[PDB]
Amino acid sequence: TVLTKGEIVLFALRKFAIASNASLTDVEPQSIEDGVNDLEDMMSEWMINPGDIGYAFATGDEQPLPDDESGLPRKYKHAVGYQLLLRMLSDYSLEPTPQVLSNAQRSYDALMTDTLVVPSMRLE
């Protein structure tokens, strides 16, 4: 295994459960199987914007499963997992901790952009 859909989902579900418990709302997190549908849907939305990161979608009649490879390298786990977490928190009006918000924004920025160091146009 490299990085399964289930592992990404569990990363988010674990953190959701912590937030949910803290808020006393005591919302039960969805199953890993249903969280995979949530991830699949988020990835589908991203295809529209900001674009394709190479996720391996279930096609045709296939149902995505926790043990399916995500198509992503392990280094993407936090970036995608934190976005899935923000999605889940938002569903139950739970505000993310400042740490979660920061981790999500920094990992997302790192996933979607790069900063290149080049000789200046004047020098080139």
Q: How far apart are CA 17 and CA 45, in angstroms?
A: 24
Nearest to 65 by CA among 86, 28, 101, 39: 39
Binding mask 6-25 for Ca ion (x = CB under 5 A): --------------------
Q: Which does 114 bind (CB under 5 to 8 A by kind): Mg ion, Ca ion, none?
A: Mg ion
If the CB atoms of residues 50 and 54 are measured against Ca ion, the closer one turns out to be: 54
If the CB atoms of residues 14 and 75 are measured against Mg ion, the closer one turns out to be: 75
* 97 within 8 A of 105, measured Cβ to Cβ: no
Nearest to 54 by CA among 32, 35, 80: 80
Regarding 71 and contact with Ca ion (CB under 5 A), the answer is yes
Regarding 66 and contact with Ca ion (CB under 5 A), the answer is no
List beta partners, residue 69: 4
Query: Residues 54, 74, 91, 112: which binds Ca ion (CB under 5 A)?
Result: 54
Residue ranges of the binding site: 1, 54, 60, 71
